[PDB]
Design a binder for this molecule. Structure first.
Ligand SMILES: O[C@@H]1CO[C@@H]2OCC[C@@H]21
Ligand SMILES: O[C@@H]1CO[C@@H]2OCC[C@@H]21
Ligand SMILES: O[C@@H]1CO[C@@H]2OCC[C@@H]21
Ligand SMILES: O[C@@H]1CO[C@@H]2OCC[C@@H]21
Ligand SMILES: O[C@@H]1CO[C@@H]2OCC[C@@H]21
Ligand SMILES: O[C@@H]1CO[C@@H]2OCC[C@@H]21
Ligand SMILES: O[C@@H]1CO[C@@H]2OCC[C@@H]21
Ligand SMILES: O[C@@H]1CO[C@@H]2OCC[C@@H]21
Ligand SMILES: O[C@@H]1CO[C@@H]2OCC[C@@H]21
Ligand SMILES: O[C@@H]1CO[C@@H]2OCC[C@@H]21
Ligand SMILES: O[C@@H]1CO[C@@H]2OCC[C@@H]21
Ligand SMILES: O[C@@H]1CO[C@@H]2OCC[C@@H]21
Ligand SMILES: O[C@@H]1CO[C@@H]2OCC[C@@H]21
Ligand SMILES: O[C@@H]1CO[C@@H]2OCC[C@@H]21
Ligand SMILES: O[C@@H]1CO[C@@H]2OCC[C@@H]21
Ligand SMILES: O[C@@H]1CO[C@@H]2OCC[C@@H]21
Ligand SMILES: O[C@@H]1CO[C@@H]2OCC[C@@H]21
Ligand SMILES: O[C@@H]1CO[C@@H]2OCC[C@@H]21
Lengths: 124, 124
């Protein structure tokens, strides 16, 4: 199995590009990151910043997670992100995603020692 | 009990202002909209557009909800919104919220006849 931290990296980190390259970005990334393997993951966000910048969020603004847990953190600054969301004719195993690029604060849940992101809660 | 539609209006509609008026906007609105009555609701978004503009989202871009349901819709345009999130010393019944104003697409789940918003899924 993956560690929680490694799974966060796989699902949510894209430090290789400053933003989505095209309207097919999500189709490509959801597939290559193994998020369409056993089902179509309905919604997923990729962050276009360094791993260090995203891990740093765990020592930024402490806020409540959507479920009421206390280990969530909101980035002080906005970050380049891409929201990927299933759309239209999407039906496993023929997944299809809408790509929406934006610049927003991210909110992540952190755990462990070292204290690192393990869930993407939301973006604002 | 409230209808689902009326509950959405109570939790999520603020057509009276173009944006959050101050850093205390969320403290005021979470209280006056009864979201701190029996507990501190951890996270909640208010939309600063007409009720008609928000209801109109139900006939815009059909996308998957975070849970995989198919009745979610993403606004074609961005809208003025305020994210309210519990912060710091927040402990029922002394709720405390961080106010973050932004301009984003909204995603809502719709139901019924007439087909209207019943849940706020996310914003991008
Ligand atoms: O390293 C960071 C991660 O993504 C940004 O755009 C390209 C490089 C920048
Ligand atoms: O808007 C985002 C922020 O930085 C990226 O470079 C091109 C656009 C991307
Ligand atoms: O097309 C836009 C412009 O720059 C971004 O980096 C990858 C492609 C994005
Ligand atoms: O960054 C966004 C994502 O895809 C669009 O087409 C290229 C740039 C636009
Ligand atoms: O374009 C890419 C290539 O393969 C992905 O699955 C469908 C289309 C996606
Ligand atoms: O699919 C997208 C398109 O550009 C990114 O770099 C590698 C693949 C990524
Ligand atoms: O918080 C983590 C710990 O190491 C990274 O470099 C700076 C911040 C990142
Ligand atoms: O409530 C506080 C907020 O962050 C600390 O670490 C986890 C919970 C502790
Ligand atoms: O975390 C979820 C995934 O997509 C949504 O956009 C903002 C955050 C929401
Ligand atoms: O009616 C709409 C709802 O909120 C906007 O700013 C004030 C009026 C506008
Ligand atoms: O940014 C939002 C969009 O419209 C509002 O008027 C003042 C700022 C508010
Ligand atoms: O202060 C800003 C400027 O205009 C917005 O409408 C209410 C207050 C907001
Ligand atoms: O709109 C945002 C929300 O609160 C800030 O102070 C007033 C305007 C700023
Ligand atoms: O400022 C307002 C007034 O009452 C709310 O609960 C705490 C503070 C909030
Ligand atoms: O609390 C906020 C401050 O301004 C809005 O109009 C009525 C109260 C709302
Ligand atoms: O979709 C709903 C139905 O009535 C409202 O006025 C236009 C759109 C709104
Ligand atoms: O799958 C489609 C998408 O919208 C229709 O109404 C509910 C589900 C139907
Ligand atoms: O719906 C939730 C509530 O707050 C988050 O900001 C974007 C949407 C997320």
């Amino acid at each position: 199995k993956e560690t929680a931290a490694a799974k966060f990296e796989r699902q949510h980190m894209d430090s290789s590009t400053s933003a989505a390259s095209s309207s097919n970005y999500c189709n490509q990334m959801m597939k290559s990151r193994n998020l369409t393997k056993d089902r179509c993951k309905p919604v997923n966000t990729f962050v276009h910043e360094s791993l260090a910048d995203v891990q740093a969020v765990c020592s930024q603004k402490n806020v409540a997670c959507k479920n009421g847990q206390t280990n969530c953190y909101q980035s002080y600054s906005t970050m380049s992100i891409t929201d990927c969301r299933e759309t239209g004719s999407s039906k496993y195993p023929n997944c299809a995603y809408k790509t929406t690029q934006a610049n927003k604060h991210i909110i992540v849940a952190c755990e462990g020692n070292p204290y690192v992101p393990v869930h993407f809660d939301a973006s604002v």
